[PDB]
Amino acid sequence: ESIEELNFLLHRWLDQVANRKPNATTGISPQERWAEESLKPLPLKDYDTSYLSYRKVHWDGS
DNA sequence: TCATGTCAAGGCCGATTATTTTTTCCCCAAAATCGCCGGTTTAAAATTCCCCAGAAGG
């Protein structure tokens, strides 16, 4: 009934089975290969992805 | 070094485990069938005993 609930269930399902079941070709649990991965470090501050609009305040202040 | 399809599930087969049913084996008792031996009966074959004729010897 809520997208937050759906995302929570999806993440739990992934971490339970999807990223735990061994792959049919690599034949190994994805998390072990993840541990083998070497990704570049993240920046401290994330690229701000937020709608930016300019508005005007009414006479009263509303 | 570019760019470059990949993973999961379903179905089928084989092997293993569990449950049920059927068949066999062993031992004991009773009945039936079959086998062997002996005796009896029937049929066929063999041997010995009396009178007629022929042949041989003195």
**Structure token pair of residue A9:** 């269930």
* Nucleic strand B near CB of residue A16 (< 7 Å): no
Q: Experimental technique used?
A: cryo-EM
* Nucleic strand B near CB of residue A21 (< 7 Å): yes
Q: How far is the CA of A34 from the C1' of B20 (A)?
A: 54
Cα dihedral A9/A14/A16/A20 (nearest 10): 180
* Nucleic strand B near CB of residue A31 (< 7 Å): no
d(CA A20, CA A48): 32
Residues composing chain A? 62
Closest CA to A30 of A14, A41, A42: A14
* Nucleic strand B near CB of residue A23 (< 7 Å): yes
d(CA A18, CA A11): 9
User: Which residues, including other chains, have CB under 8 Å from residue A33's CB and lie 6 or more apart?
Assistant: A26
